[PDB]
């Protein structure tokens, strides 16, 4: 009786939201950006190849100086690279080799990683002893760690396969906030530029916008037909793009609370692993299972170019803060740095 | 390059030296993924031979490393991609419990038809045969109740039952095996092959059966690249 009545009200509320979104869908992003000229052909060359990982690379993250990056592989090794010289700055042996994510702190003093061990380990890069040591092991998740991002040296947000995201206080080792509401494994998260909000994509084909301080879900974005594997905020923080296993990328708007554009091609039938934006946000770069990275025109949904330099799955990619280069990691155990030439 | 860059480059080369030394020891070991349910008894199989539970055992100067993932929920369609380069998947089921056999068959279908497990052979184990033999002999529960096709199933002549086994056991035991193999042969196009086996909680030959099956899995890969198969 009460349960039947309540679940009927949820359907009415969903129709209310759908009507509200349809009410503000006066125009389409495609119509708005039809007049603007295309970006042309985007040609990027492999400037650097980072060799030394002996297994599948699963994650990478640039440091804020746009020169150092950290990559994680399932050979049980965290490596910090000097991208200008390809020198290895550090090699951190992981207690658990089944790592799935890695993050570089914006200060550059810490790195984080974690995988099937359900632990987010914090490593101190600046010690008087001259070596990298474990500073914290964040326990509390009941599923695998899928993504992690530092807010500062003391706060980090993690997404897990137990359908929840958590905000952690690194100094005390306790999760201050728990983000619940996803019905599937959360596979990725992206921080807003002001670090007041973050979006997460799960296997329920939905993206939820969370308030860091308040700790609740503000908005829910649907439209994908399969598990979401990747998510990335637009550089101004008013939009984000997702990547799913249905070979499509979708651009959702926070304020319009709906999808604005779909990035898919008929030839593409493989899942998407990673997504990122260029510094101005005009380019959307996506990594695919078909060993390639496709550069999309974010405004016009045109495939601007292709980065074909890997012989296995493109598992991760990231663009530097200054926008100078893009790094791609792959299951072939190599990292490559790309940028164009005049 | 400056004097500090040369010293930094020397540091980088020392790291690569230690990366190869640590990475060379992992190439000689074969990686195995252990799958099953709570009642499958896969913990008994590893214990007899001996987030992530690991086990290392040696069979004739060959090192096997079997990984059991007991810290995750039922939805394994996502983290199964990590075990894309394992040699074999050791899938364990409980034969005695006919009620959950359909669940095991549905579970095995997802693993076999997985997108990222197209080239991974499955060393299927049907654990707890002694309990199955007693259950069939008692006759309280009949497989025909759960599987209607069992009443119309006849034991093939090519079957070679173990000595001292009642014909009733052979008809039931091979019917359960035929259900799993029928799923294997349906798809895959010969890329990977299932290796069903029947074991019990007191069986001590589990390690050797994995050894022989892993030999066939590697042998098929060598013949495949030489275009001999």
């Amino acid at each position, epitope marked *: 009786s009460e349960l039947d009545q309540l679940r009927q009200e949820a359907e009415q509320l969903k129709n209310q939201i759908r009507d509200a979104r349809k009410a503000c869908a006066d125009a389409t992003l495609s119509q708005i950006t039809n007049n603007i000229d295309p970006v042309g052909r985007i040609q990027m060359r492999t400037r650097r190849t980072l060799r030394g990982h002996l297994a599948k690379i699963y994650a990478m993250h640039w440091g804020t100086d746009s020169r150092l990056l950290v990559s994680a592989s399932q050979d049980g090794k965290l490596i910090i690279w000097d991208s200008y*010289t390809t*020198n290895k700055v550090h090699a951190i042996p992981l207690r658990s080799s089944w790592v799935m994510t890695c993050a570089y702190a914006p200060s550059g003093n810490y790195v984080a990683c974690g995988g099937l061990d359900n632990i987010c380990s914090i490593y101190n890069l600046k010690t008087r*002893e*001259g070596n990298v040591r474990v500073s914290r092991e964040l326990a509390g998740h009941t599923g695998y760690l899928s993504c992690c991002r530092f807010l500062d040296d003391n706060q980090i947000v993690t997404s897990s396969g137990d359908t929840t995201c958590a905000l952690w206080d690194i100094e005390t080792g306790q999760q201050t906030t728990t983000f619940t509401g996803h019905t599937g494994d959360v596979m990725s998260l992206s921080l807003a530029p002001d670090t007041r909000l973050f979006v997460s994509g799960a296997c329920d084909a939905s993206a939820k916008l969370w308030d860091v301080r308040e700790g609740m879900c503000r908005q829910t974005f649907t439209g994908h037909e399969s598990d979401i594997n990747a998510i990335c905020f637009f550089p101004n923080g008013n939009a984000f793009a997702t990547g799913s296993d249905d070979a499509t990328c979708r651009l959702f708007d926070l304020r319009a609370d709906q999808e604005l554009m779909t990035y898919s091609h008929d030839n593409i039938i493989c899942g998407i692993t990673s997504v990122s934006f260029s510094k101005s946000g005009r380019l959307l770069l996506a990594g695919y299972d078909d060993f390639n990275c496709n550069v999309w025109d974010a405004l016009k949904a045109d495939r601007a170019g292709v980065l074909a330099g890997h012989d296995n799955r493109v598992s991760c990619l990231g663009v530097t803060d200054d926008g100078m280069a893009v790094a791609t990691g792959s299951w072939d155990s190599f990292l490559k740095i790309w940028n164009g030439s005049s | *390059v*400056s004097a*500090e860059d040369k010293a*930094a480059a*020397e540091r980088s080369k020392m790291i690569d030296k230690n990366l190869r030394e640590d990475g060379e020891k992992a190439r000689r070991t074969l990686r195995l993924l252990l799958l099953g349910a709570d009642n499958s008894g896969k913990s008994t199989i590893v214990k007899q031979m001996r987030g992530i539970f690991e086990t290392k055992f040696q069979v004739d100067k060959v090192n096997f490393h079997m990984f059991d993932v007991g810290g995750q929920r039922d939805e394994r369609r996502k983290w199964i991609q990590c075990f894309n380069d394992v040699t074999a998947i050791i899938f364990v089921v409980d034969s005695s419990d006919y009620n959950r056999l359909q669940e095991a068959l549905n579970d095995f279908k997802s693993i076999w038809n997985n997108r990222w497990l197209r080239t991974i052979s499955v060393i299927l184990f049907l654990n707890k045969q002694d309990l199955l033999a007693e259950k069939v002999l008692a006759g309280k529960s009949k497989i025909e109740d759960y599987f209607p096709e069992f009443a119309r199933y006849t034991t093939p002549e090519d079957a070679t039952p173990e000595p001292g086994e009642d014909p009733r056991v052979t008809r039931a035991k091979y019917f359960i095996r035929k259900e799993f193999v029928d799923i294997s042969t349906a798809s895959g196009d010969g890329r990977h092959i299932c290796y069903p086996h029947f074991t019990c909680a007191v069986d001590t030959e589990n390690a050797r059966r994995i050894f022989n099956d892993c030999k066939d899995i590697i042998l098929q890969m060598n013949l495949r690249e030489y275009n001999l198969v």
Partner: single-chain antibody, 231 residues
């Protein structure tokens, strides 16, 4: 805590041989390159030798090349300096200095207490030998180099050290602008090309000492004469 203890020094006859040891504790010794730096009595610092991490690279100063041999024992965390044909010019306090080299590292960050031995090229100029100072007043120290220390990679390999009376030198500024760990923010290093300035805002009693500027553009590493601060 990080420690570097030197031993083996003492009065030796001319033409003799002596073995200096540097025992390291509290840090990963095998990860750090090691230098020997000596200081003649009432004189400035003089670099002697360098051995890299892993013992693959070894450098010597010309005044000691062929007579001194530097070696390390990684399992024992001991640094060695075998000296032969010792002359009266070798009478100095020998310092054990650790230095690690990677992007953003701080070489020469920790110095040992030193051991005393008694026997019976880019030019770095610090023209101002002494500077009378008062607490709370801003002081600037100038350093000059015969060659430009700015490399094509953007680094300017200039270092600043402070040797308080009775104490070993301590790193203040590395690569001409970066502030060493544990150093108050009042110290600031500014430079361009061949001219460099060390600014000390709100001078205190602890800042009293001798200041040395060192170049790390190329070997042999050379020190300036040194500027002394007195009250």
């Amino acid at each position: 805590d990080v420690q570097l203890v030197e031993s083996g020094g003492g009065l030796v006859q001319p033409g003799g041989s002596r073995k200096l040891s540097c025992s390291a504790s509290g840090f990963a010794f095998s990860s750090f390159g090691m230098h020997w730096v000596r200081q003649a009595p009432e004189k400035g610092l003089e670099w002697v030798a360098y051995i890299s991490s892993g013992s693959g690279t070894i450098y010597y100063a010309d005044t000691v090349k062929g007579r001194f041999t530097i070696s390390r024992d990684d399992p024992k965390n001991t640094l060695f300096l075998q000296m032969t044909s010792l002359r009266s010019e070798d009478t100095a306090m020998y310092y054990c200095v650790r230095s690690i080299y990677y992007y953003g590292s701080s070489p020469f960050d920790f110095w040992g207490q030193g051991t005393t031995l008694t026997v019976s090229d880019i030019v770095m100029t610090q023209a101002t030998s002494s500077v009378p100072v008062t607490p709370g007043e801003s002081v600037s120290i100038s350093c000059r180099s015969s060659k430009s220390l700015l490399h094509s990679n953007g680094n300017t390999y200039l270092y600043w050290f402070l040797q308080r009376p009775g104490q070993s030198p301590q790193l203040l500024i590395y690569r001409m602008s970066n502030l060493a760990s544990g150093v108050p923010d009042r110290f600031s290093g500014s430079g361009s090309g061949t001219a460099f300035t060390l600014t000390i805002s709100r001078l205190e009693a602890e800042d009293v000492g001798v200041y040395y500027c060192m170049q790390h553009l190329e070997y042999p590493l050379t020190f300036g004469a040194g500027t002394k601060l007195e009250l």
